[PDB]
Structures are given as C-alpha cells and as structure tokens.
Amino acid sequence: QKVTFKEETYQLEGKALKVGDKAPDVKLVNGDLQEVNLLKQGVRFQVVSALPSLTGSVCLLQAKHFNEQTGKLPSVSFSVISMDLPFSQGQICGAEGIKDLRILSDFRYKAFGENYGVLLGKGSLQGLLARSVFVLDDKGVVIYKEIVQNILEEPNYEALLKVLK
C-alpha cells in the first residue's frame, strides 16, 4: 500500500500488520509524560487510530470524532497516536475541547509506527504516522484495518461503526 499527499506518494515503513495478526503492545507517552502500554484488557473492542499531526484540519476532525465516540461507547477503548510531543497534544486538545480522548505520543520509541507499519517514508511527512484505524477484538487480534489512501481524507467511520456493533 502507498499513501498519497498532493503530488507526493509514500512507502509505509515498519512491520506490516494485517487482519488476523495479534496486535503488538507498544510503549507510548501521555500528557503527564508517563510511559503507557497501548493495549487495554477487559474491553470488547480496542480502536487505535494514528494521524500525521493534531495541528492538521483533517487530523483535528479525526481526533474530535474519536473524542465524541469515547463518551458514546464505554465498552470500546479509543486511542489516538501521533508524533506530536505530549505537550502540544495537551495544548491542542485543551484549545479544541478534546478532554475525554486517550491521546498518546509515539515520539520516544516510534514503536507504534514501527510495529503497526504506518511510519511514512521519504517525503515532506517522513517520520510522521499515516492516517490509519485498527480495531482489535478482546484477545488483541486485528479484526479491522484502514490505512487511508489519500492522507487528506478522513477515515471511513461508517465501516468502523459496523465493526463495533
């Protein structure tokens, strides 16, 4: 799969993760500069979403969609990951009224990008995370995957909600 941003085409770097694969646990950093494990136990579905930067317009809509869904379905875990430092994640979420969303930074280890295969290769956005959604079942197996072909498009939310019923 190759992701497009205007005239740029991107190779995805890191290990390819497909529907049926056990999703690896990875170390991320939260707004308190606390190291956390991505995976949550005692939850029917885990939704993990990545975006290139919370400073983007399309990116903010994505974060705002998953913030709202956090309150709507408590039996589902929602996580949003970017390469933004936790400081700017906290400030953007604070400015834009995103107070429920589990917002995590991949900056320290790039473990999410490397292990979910959404690291953007050579180009202006190199080292940022491709716009993407993974859903894991109660056993941490990938049951749904979207890496958005055009990074300026939002994820397919209709496809995602069908998986969560």
Side-chain angles (χ1 to χ4, degrees):
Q1 156 140 27
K2 282 158 267 283
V3 169
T4 66
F5 179 51
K6 298 157 159 193
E7 289 287 6
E8 292 185 307
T9 300
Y10 289 88
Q11 71 201 135
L12 298 172
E13 295 184 346
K15 303 185 193 74
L17 195 69
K18 31 181 169 63
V19 169
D21 283 349
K22 164 57 181 140
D25 209 351
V26 295
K27 293 291 183 189
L28 302 163
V29 183
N30 73 6
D32 296 324
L33 296 181
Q34 178 175 327
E35 287 198 353
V36 305
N37 297 322
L38 176 60
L39 301 187
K40 306 278 282 197
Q41 297 105 64
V43 73
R44 200 165 149 247
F45 299 113
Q46 304 176 62
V47 182
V48 183
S49 189
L51 46 85
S53 173
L54 277 185
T55 66
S57 318
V58 176
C59 297
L60 202 70
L61 287 177
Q62 181 172 339
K64 282 185 178 175
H65 185 274
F66 288 124
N67 186 62
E68 304 264 314
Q69 295 291 307
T70 302
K72 279 275 192 63
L73 306 94
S75 53
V76 176
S77 182
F78 295 94
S79 295
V80 170
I81 319 299
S82 77
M83 284 298 177
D84 303 292
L85 291 192
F87 307 114
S88 285
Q89 294 188 325
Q91 290 189 348
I92 294 158
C93 286
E96 298 296 333
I98 300 166
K99 293 214 176 161
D100 290 298
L101 180 59
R102 186 174 186 244
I103 182 64
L104 304 172
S105 184
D106 205 26
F107 88 92
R108 182 167 291 168
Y109 303 109
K110 303 212 167 228
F112 181 81
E114 177 56 30
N115 286 280
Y116 286 72
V118 294
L119 261 187
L120 288 172
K122 198 218 191 80
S124 67
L125 301 184
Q126 180 188 330
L128 302 178
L129 301 178
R131 188 173 324 286
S132 49
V133 178
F134 300 83
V135 186
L136 322 179
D137 60 15
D138 64 311
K139 293 189 145 187
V141 176
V142 180
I143 70 182
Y144 177 87
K145 171 175 174 191
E146 192 196 4
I147 302 180
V148 183
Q149 168 65 61
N150 183 353
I151 211 169
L152 285 175
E153 290 190 26
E154 275 184 286
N156 190 339
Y157 300 125
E158 283 287 354
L160 180 56
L161 266 292
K162 198 175 194 265
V163 170
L164 295 178
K165 177 180 167 181

